[PDB]
Amino acid sequence: SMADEATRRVVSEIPVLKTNAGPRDRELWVQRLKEEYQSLIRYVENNKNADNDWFRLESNKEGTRWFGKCWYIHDLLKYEFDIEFDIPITYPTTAPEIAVPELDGKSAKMYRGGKICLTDHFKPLWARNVPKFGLAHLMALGLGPWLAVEIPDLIQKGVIHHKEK
Numbered sequence: 001s002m003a004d005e006a007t008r009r010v011v012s013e014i015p016v017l018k019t020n021a022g023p024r025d026r027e028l029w030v031q032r033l034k035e036e037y038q039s040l041i042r043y044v045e046n047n048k049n050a051d052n053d054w055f056r057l058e059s060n061k062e063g064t065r066w067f068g069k070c071w072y073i074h075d076l077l078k079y080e081f082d083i084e085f086d087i088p089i090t091y092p093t094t095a096p097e098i099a100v101p102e103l104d105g106k107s108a109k110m111y112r113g114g115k116i117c118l119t120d121h122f123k124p125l126w127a128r129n130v131p132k133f134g135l136a137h138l139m140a141l142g143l144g145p146w147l148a149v150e151i152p153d154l155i156q157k158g159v160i161h162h163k164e165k
Helices: 002-011 026-049 122-129 135-156
Strands: 055-059 065-074 077-086
Touching: 002 122, 002 135, 026 055, 026 135, 055 135, 065 135, 077 135, 122 135
Parallel strands: none
Antiparallel strands: 055 065, 065 077
């Protein structure tokens, strides 16, 4: 399987998650959040070591609303976008929907209201890994490759401009 190897190559140094809990699930949700934060911070460390430190994320106190920034490099210029998402009640079986609000209306690969539209292979990939994947994997397998198509396309089309700073 090409798909299985490609997935492993991208995610095999990201800590795997374990707990089946979503936002309503009390002590089990607190445990799931420990897994999410340990997986995210190891992914960030790996990214820094790879010269690919490409996002920051924070949450509200209960871990149900996430927001931060991602960065994308094209022809050596660095572009920054704000990102946000909510945690679905049926997480982690259901995947969260990342939004990049500044690009609302600017990419055909997006829904009304700024949510990115991933390819049809992402959902079954998430589904077959539940509950091992978390927010680090959503970033690595979902937003990362979305940016790698859409940002170059929108720069070429003259939709995205770099601000002289």
